[PDB]
C-alpha cells in the first residue's frame, strides 16, 4: 500500500464507447482505447456462510482486491509502453542534467520548458537526493498545500513522492513535470462511469458462478487510460544520479 498521488491529482474525463480521439498537429488523430485491470475473486462457500458475524469477510476480501487493482492502475499509468507517462513524452521535452546529482539549476531548467507547471513527481529516494543538494547550498524551500495536505515544493510547485517510478541498478531515476486539466490542455485521465454494475465509479463486480468445489468466483474490472493533449504538457528529467 502506498500513496497513489497520480490518481489523486489527475483530473478524469468521461469517455463514451471506450474510445477517445485527440487531434495531432506535428496527421491522423490518435485514438485512445480504455485498458482494463481484471482479477478473479475466489471465496469458499463456507466462509461466505458462517464467517459473517464479526465482519462480512466477503466485503473485506472485496476491498482488499480493489486496493490491489488501484495499485496496478498507478503502476500502468507510469510504466505502460502504450500510454504510460514515461514513454509518451516528446523528444524535445526530455532533458538531461548538467552533472550526476539533481541540482537546483536542473530543477529550474525543467520548469522553464512549459507554461504553468503544476506538479512534480519523483521517487522517494530521488527526493532525498534533491534535499541534499539544497542543504549544500544553504537554501530552505518553503512548501505548499495540495488537496488539504501540506507537501514539499520548489518555486511553489508541489513535489510528490511516487514509488512506481523505476530505479535503475546503476542508481538512476527520473523526475516528471506536467500540466493538468483539459481547459489547460494538460494531461488528463480517461475513464467511463455509469457501467451497469458499479461497485465504485468505473469499477464493476459480476457474479460469474460457482465451480465443482464450493468456491464462489467474482469478476472485478476497472477501465482506465491516460492522454497527453499537447506535446509540451509533459517533461522528463532523464538520468538523475541518486545515491551519491
Numbering used by the authors: 44 to 69, 254 to 471
Task: Copy the relevant paper text.
Encapsulins are a prevalent protein‐based compartmentalization strategy in prokaryotes. Family 2, the most abundant class of encapsulins, is further subdivided into Family 2A and Family 2B based on the absence or presence, respectively, of a putative cyclic nucleotide binding domain (CBD) inserted into the E‐loop of the HK97 fold encapsulin shell protein. In this work, we report the characterization of a Family 2B two‐component encapsulin shell identified in Streptomyces lydicus (Sl). Through heterologous expression and purification studies, we show the differential assembly behavior of the two shell components – Sl‐Enc1 and Sl‐Enc2 – and demonstrate their ability to co‐assemble into mixed shells with variable shell composition.
In contrast, Sl‐Enc2 formed characteristic ca. 28 nm shells, consistent with other T = 1 Family 2B encapsulins. That is to say, the Sl‐Enc1 majority sample yielded a symmetry‐averaged Sl‐Enc1 shell map while the Sl‐Enc2 majority sample resulted in a symmetry‐averaged Sl‐Enc2 shell density. Sl‐Enc2 can assemble into complete shells by itself. Therefore, we used the symmetry‐averaged Sl‐Enc2 map to build a model for a complete homogeneous Sl‐Enc2 shell. The Sl‐Enc2 shell is 28 nm in diameter, consists of 60 identical protomers, and exhibits T = 1 icosahedral symmetry, similar to recently described Family 2B encapsulins. Overall, the homogeneous Sl‐Enc2 shell is similar to recently structurally characterized Family 2B encapsulins with externally displayed CBDs being positioned above all two‐fold pores. The two‐fold pores are large and elongated with dimensions of 14 by 60 Å and partially occluded by the CBDs. The absence of any resolvable N‐arms in the homogeneous Sl‐Enc2 shell contributes to the large dimensions of these pores. Two additional types of pores are present in the Sl‐Enc2 shell at the five‐ and three‐fold axes of symmetry with diameters of 6 and 3 Å, respectively. Symmetrical Sl‐Enc2 or mixed interactions never exhibited resolved N‐arms in our 3D classes.
